[PDB]
Design a protein around this ligand. Structure first.
Ligand SMILES: Nc1ncnc2c1ncn2[C@@H]1O[C@H](COP(=O)(O)OP(=O)(O)OP(=O)(O)O)[C@@H](O)[C@H]1O
Ligand SMILES: Nc1ncnc2c1ncn2[C@@H]1O[C@H](COP(=O)(O)OP(=O)(O)OP(=O)(O)O)[C@@H](O)[C@H]1O
Ligand SMILES: Nc1ncnc2c1ncn2[C@@H]1O[C@H](COP(=O)(O)OP(=O)(O)OP(=O)(O)O)[C@@H](O)[C@H]1O
Ligand SMILES: O=C(O)CCC(=O)C(=O)O
Ligand SMILES: O=C(O)CCC(=O)C(=O)O
Ligand SMILES: O=C(O)CCC(=O)C(=O)O
Ligand SMILES: [Mg+2]
Ligand SMILES: [Mg+2]
Ligand SMILES: [Mg+2]
Ligand SMILES: [Mg+2]
Lengths: 112, 112, 103
């Protein structure tokens, strides 16, 4: 079982959600975060700007999915978010040891 | 070691917190998120509403605990949050490879 | 690969950030959270914290953990916790680079 975590530009949330819905994902969690990547949050070109570091608003998307679906989920997020521009995002896949649907007690692959 | 991550209805935070403190947890992190589950955020019953997707406010509760204690934590959260209604929550358990208490430098299960 | 997650005092964010970027880290995610530890929010209550998340390779995560530990410490209760999780796969969206190349 996999937790696919993606950090994307906020305006891309709808398209990413749409892309995942098409795959039949059974749930999604999103949160507000800030971050930088290898350009260190630089959006200006004043002298010395590359020595600065800034945090930029992002959205973190988390989707719990089965092993036989996670690769397609990763690809869908890539395809939805990629516009060929810096900051378009990064995806991290983590493993889920156990899952439980609170209302029903269903577990693991049933619970995703 | 295990990170227990529960996504619950916001109004249940206090009852879940109290259940866990009574159980004896020694730490807890909470954050605001939005999300949907297998009902796609549907809270209305008008004709066609079943084709829509919405994000609902939730709270994410995270508790790092030892292997021999995580099942008790999961069940305590389930008992506190379960009211037999959709959206009552989802619990994901991830493995923690290492832990450190920053003040003291204590590690592993001693840091939790 | 590892996801190093640290819950720190909000005023320590700049030093933790600088410790990491000076070390050579080239990405960082931060979130607003609340929490309590062994002292139950007492000098039960929730207190504001920052969650820092850094994805790093196996050969650098120990340096990263140590850098955060030193940077976030003050010797006072509430200094925080570092939890290290494993990352199975990573992708840089723009380039399609994967795993350690993506971080
Ligand atoms: N190593 C990392 N650890 C934690 N979060 C990261 C890491 N790298 C990136 N992030 C998060 O992902 C967001 C998007 O990163 P971004 O797309 O800028 O990656 P990048 O490596 O700089 O690639 P690009 O050159 O395409 O910009 C960042 O703002 C940050 O929130
Ligand atoms: N597969 C998933 N991936 C990521 N987050 C999820 C997933 N399933 C649920 N969540 C998160 O958990 C919250 C609560 O989910 P919820 O209790 O509705 O689960 P469910 O599977 O729909 O069960 P129920 O039928 O009891 O509603 C969601 O709003 C979302 O934030
Ligand atoms: N076991 C835990 N699970 C989840 N979050 C935790 C845990 N322990 C601590 N945290 C988070 O880390 C923050 C800081 O914890 P804190 O430094 O107070 O830990 P502590 O064990 O009480 O150590 P100290 O005695 O140095 O205060 C908490 O407010 C909470 O957000
Ligand atoms: O995130 C952006 O929008 C541009 C800045 C960037 O790519 C970075 O900080 O790595
Ligand atoms: O989250 C709710 O309160 C109801 C909606 C729901 O259960 C879902 O989207 O899965
Ligand atoms: O978080 C603080 O700043 C002090 C309270 C504390 O250490 C705790 O709740 O464990
Ligand atoms: Mg970038
Ligand atoms: Mg539901
Ligand atoms: Mg404490
Ligand atoms: Mg593992």
């Amino acid at each position: 079982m996999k937790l696919v975590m993606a950090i994307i530009k906020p305006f891309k949330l709808d398209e990413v959600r749409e892309a995942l819905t098409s795959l039949g994902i059974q749930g999604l969690t999103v949160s507000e975060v800030k971050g930088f990547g290898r350009q260190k949050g630089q959006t200006e070109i004043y002298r010395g700007a590359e020595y600065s570091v800034s945090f930029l608003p992002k959205v973190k998307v988390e989707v719990a999915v089965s092993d036989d679906q996670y690769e397609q989920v990763v690809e869908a997020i890539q395809k939805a978010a990629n516009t060929g521009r810096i900051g378009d995002g990064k995806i991290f896949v983590l493993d889920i040891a156990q899952a439980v649907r609170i209302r029903t007690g269903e577990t693991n692959t049933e619970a995703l």
